Design an enzyme around this catalytic site. Structure first.
Site, PDB file in Angstrom:
ATOM      1  N   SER A 197      30.286  38.470  24.172  1.00  0.00           N
ATOM      2  CA  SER A 197      29.838  39.527  25.085  1.00  0.00           C
ATOM      3  C   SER A 197      30.650  40.820  24.833  1.00  0.00           C
ATOM      4  CB  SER A 197      30.041  39.077  26.527  1.00  0.00           C
ATOM      5  OG  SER A 197      29.140  38.078  26.908  1.00  0.00           O
ATOM      6  N   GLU A 238      19.796  38.408  23.486  1.00  0.00           N
ATOM      7  CA  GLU A 238      20.045  39.715  22.871  1.00  0.00           C
ATOM      8  C   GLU A 238      20.525  39.438  21.446  1.00  0.00           C
ATOM      9  OE1 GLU A 238      23.022  41.183  25.762  1.00  0.00           O
ATOM     10  OE2 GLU A 238      21.658  42.943  26.104  1.00  0.00           O
ATOM     11  N   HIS A 261      23.284  36.472  21.697  1.00  0.00           N
ATOM     12  CA  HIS A 261      23.885  36.504  23.018  1.00  0.00           C
ATOM     13  C   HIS A 261      22.933  35.918  24.033  1.00  0.00           C
ATOM     14  CE1 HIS A 261      25.629  39.142  26.492  1.00  0.00           C
ATOM     15  NE2 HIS A 261      26.545  38.241  26.201  1.00  0.00           N
ATOM     16  N   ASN A 293      24.604  43.675  29.993  1.00  0.00           N
ATOM     17  CA  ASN A 293      25.917  43.841  30.684  1.00  0.00           C
ATOM     18  C   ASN A 293      26.280  45.325  30.932  1.00  0.00           C
ATOM     19  OD1 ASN A 293      26.488  41.138  31.254  1.00  0.00           O
ATOM     20  ND2 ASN A 293      27.414  40.875  29.280  1.00  0.00           N
TER      21      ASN A 293
END
Lengths: 282, 282
Positions: free
Chosen positions: A117, A150, A138, A188
């Site tokens: 991340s 992702e 991800h 995020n």
């Protein structure tokens, strides 16, 4: 692709193992100790049992998925897999060692992906002689349930590597999105500053916790309020991601609130410690 | 409370009339021309017909609801209202004029509320001699359906005025949350900068429009992607709110992207113009 190697048998690694196995891939999961590998297998097994009790899958389905998964402590078993997904510790020196090692071990065709991340896929790729085949993949907790992946292209990630990972994601029933590597990717970068803004609202006496969360649920149709979400994600995770966005960009837009840093310092990390914005129990 | 005065017969003002009238209030709706007023009542009638269409209310309910609503262009009909909801233009000089006038017209008990997203309740209140009875009552489109009301206390808003508005909200089936006035209150302060963040991600080549939206829906379980949401809310309204947050706080954190500004300058406002981040049709 048919054969996948996942490094790390913590929560995310095990969830990703399941995502692949549930759709018919053969998966090897590696960790550093034999009881870590076992822990992750029992994690997948409990999670499948929950799926059975919910009548989402049959007991046969459970055993079939399990039948496709094997544990090991031996990195050399990646040698013949079509895809590696690394979900180990979020440390650049160690990731570079892992990927250099995998680069030596694996057949030329193998694509090396990270579920990171917060670290640069580009930087990790540079530690191999196969940068064209290094990529971010991800997932989101819980990985068997969340549909998004992702797919993060490092500077050198080739179109061919991107296409194959896009294809693989779709084969396991996920929706891939193409991301040119940048801090926070998409999800995020939007989500964690949302939670952080909620902490500022709290810190500045604007509204109380329950009211902030009811506002977002009932005013924006959010499935959870941002303070509760933060406690679910972990306030340590939230703080870390805000620090990464700030360090990477140099942009004070991404500065974490002091209140968030104080909660983390208290060890009030949310659900996993029994207390964050809200008091839980066990 | 029995009788509510609403300023503005456009889409918000009409939703709000309907939210009060459906639940038993007499409502007088006022706008600056009779066709505006007519359009509002037309809107409400459509909406109720569709409720009848879907058998959630009878056609007699519909008539009974409409018979509680009257239209006017004359501010003087506020005199006997227990509550005023101003859902008129977002301009301070003119809000102050409306509230000063309302202060002269209304019996002493009338609470004067603004549905403003972006102006100061405190500053409006100060144009009256009843700052104790001035407050924000902030609904969300569509006001008939969205449960939240943000109840925004100005510096001078009394406890008694707050409690009355809290009770009114609950009486029309809404959930009120207490907010001490600050920029963007709760909802818009969190929500609009998320949308603006999506526009930066777009501006910076990180991901394309549909991938941004799929990410938030499939990765965070959001009911809509942020760019599609901006198109629904209106990009003009998004930009205005980022500009208020920025101008009020002096904090560069709330700077609108150049890309958002450019779309607004193009008249690509979203659904209402047939084009924002996406193209719409018929």
């Amino acid at each position: 692709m048919k054969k996948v190697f996942v490094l790390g048998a913590g929560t995310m690694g095990a969830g990703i193992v399941q995502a692949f196995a549930a759709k018919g891939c053969e998966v090897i999961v590696r960790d550093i100790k034999e009881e870590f590998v076992d822990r992750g297998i029992a994690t997948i097994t409990k999670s499948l049992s929950k799926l059975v009790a919910k009548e989402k899958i049959t007991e046969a389905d459970k055993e079939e998925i399990l039948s496709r998964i094997s544990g090991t402590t031996d990195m050399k078993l990646a040698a013949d897999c079509d895809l590696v997904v690394e979900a180990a510790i979020e440390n650049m020196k160690i990731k570079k060692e892992i990927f250099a090692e995998l680069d030596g071990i694996c057949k030329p065709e193998t694509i090396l992906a990270s579920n990171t991340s917060s670290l640069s896929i580009t930087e990790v790729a540079s530690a191999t002689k196969r940068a064209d085949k290094v990529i971010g993949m991800h997932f989101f907790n819980p990985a068997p349930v969340m549909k998004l992946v992702e797919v993060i292209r490092g500077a050198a990630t080739s179109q061919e590597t991107f296409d194959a990972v896009k294809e693989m994601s779709e084969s396991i029933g996920k929706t891939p999105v193409e991301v040119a590597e940048a801090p926070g990717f998409v999800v995020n970068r939007i989500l964690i500053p949302m939670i952080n803004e909620a902490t500022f609202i709290l810190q500045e006496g604007v509204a109380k916790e329950e009211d902030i969360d009811a506002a977002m649920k009932l005013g924006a149709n959010h499935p959870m309020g941002p303070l509760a979400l933060g406690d679910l994600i972990g306030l340590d995770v939230c703080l870390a991601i805000m620090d990464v966005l700030y360090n990477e960009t140099g942009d004070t837009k991404y500065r974490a609130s002091s209140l968030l840093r104080k909660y983390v310092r208290a060890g009030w990390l949310g659900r996993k410690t029994g207390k964050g914005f809200y008091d839980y129990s066990k």
